Structure formats: C-alpha cells, structure tokens
Amino acid sequence: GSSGSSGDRCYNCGGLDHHAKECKLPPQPKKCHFCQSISHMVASCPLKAQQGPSAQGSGPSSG
Ligand SMILES: [Zn+2]
Ligand SMILES: [Zn+2]
C-alpha cells in the first residue's frame, strides 16, 4: 500500500539533502549512536572499527 516515514533527517545539523552519516560536521557530544555507550563516543567507539572483514558465520549459537 502507501507507506512512508515521518521524515528522517541528519540528527546532527539538520540536513535533508545529506544523511547524518554522510554529513561531515562533528557529531554532537551526545551518547554513542552505535552501542548506546554513554561512556565513549561513536568517534572512539572500538566496536565501530571492529577488526576482521571475515563475515562467514559468526559463532552460530542461541543464548
Ligand atoms: Zn548534517
Ligand atoms: Zn559505541
């Protein structure tokens, strides 16, 4: 049917043309927008820069 979004724009400066990600400006001092790690930021977040391009089954288990 006819569905859409309320309007998702760059939650940093307010750019509609570009996306928050593409945006260049520095990310607000808010909490990490990756792992909700209020401690560190998304710029330092280690997980973000995870090492290992290998994406062939990652320990397939439950619980
Ligand atoms: Zn922006
Ligand atoms: Zn993080």
Curated annotation (Swiss-Prot):
Primary localization: cytoplasm
Protein location: Cytoplasm; Rough endoplasmic reticulum; Cytoplasm, P-body; Cytoplasm, Stress granule
Keyword Transmembrane helix: no
Tissue specificity of this protein: Expressed in embryonic stem cells, placenta and testis. Tends to be up-regulated in HER2-overexpressing breast tumors.
Keyword terms, alphabetized: Acetylation, Cytoplasm, Endoplasmic reticulum, Metal-binding, Nucleus, Phosphoprotein, Repeat, RNA-binding, RNA-mediated gene silencing, Zinc, Zinc-finger
Gene, per the UniProt record: LIN28A
Listed result of changing H40A: Abolishes ability to suppress pre-let-7 biogenesis and localization to P-bodies without affecting pre-let-7 binding
Function, as annotated: RNA-binding protein that inhibits processing of pre-let-7 miRNAs and regulates translation of mRNAs that control developmental timing, pluripotency and metabolism. Seems to recognize a common structural G-quartet (G4) feature in its miRNA and mRNA targets. 'Translational enhancer' that drives specific mRNAs to polysomes and increases the efficiency of protein synthesis. Its association with the translational machinery and target mRNAs results in an increased number of initiation events per molecule of mRNA and, indirectly, in mRNA stabilization.
Family: Belongs to the lin-28 family.
GO molecular function, one term: pre-miRNA binding
GO biological process: cellular response to glucose stimulus; germ cell development; miRNA catabolic process; negative regulation of glial cell differentiation; negative regulation of pre-miRNA processing; negative regulation of translation; positive regulation of cell proliferation involved in kidney development; positive regulation of cytoplasmic translation
Assembly with partners or alone: Monomer. During skeletal muscle differentiation, associated with translation initiation complexes in the polysomal compartment. Directly interacts with EIF3S2. Interacts with NCL in an RNA-dependent manner. Interacts (via C-terminus) with DHX9 (via N- and C-terminus); this interaction occurs in a RNA-independent manner. Interacts with TUT4 in the presence of pre-let-7 RNA.
Domain remarks in the Swiss-Prot or TrEMBL record: The CSD domain is required for function in muscle differentiation.
Stated name of the protein: Protein lin-28 homolog A
Full-protein interval shown: 137 to 186 of 209
GO cellular component, as recorded: cytoplasm; cytoplasmic stress granule; cytosol; nucleolus; nucleus; P-body; rough endoplasmic reticulum
Induction (free text): Can be negatively regulated by the interaction of microRNAs miR-125a and miR-125b with at least two miRNA responsive elements (miREs) in the 3'-UTR of this gene. These interactions may reduce both translation efficiency and mRNA abundance. Negatively regulated by retinoic acid.
Miscellaneous: Overexpressed in primary tumors (overall frequency approximately 15%), overexpression being linked to repression of let-7 family miRNAs and derepression of let-7 targets. Facilitates cellular transformation in vitro, and overexpression is associated with advanced disease across multiple tumor types.
Keyword Zinc-finger (UniProt): yes
Lineage: Eukaryota, Metazoa, Chordata, Craniata, Vertebrata
Zn finger spans (CCHC-type): 8-25, 30-47
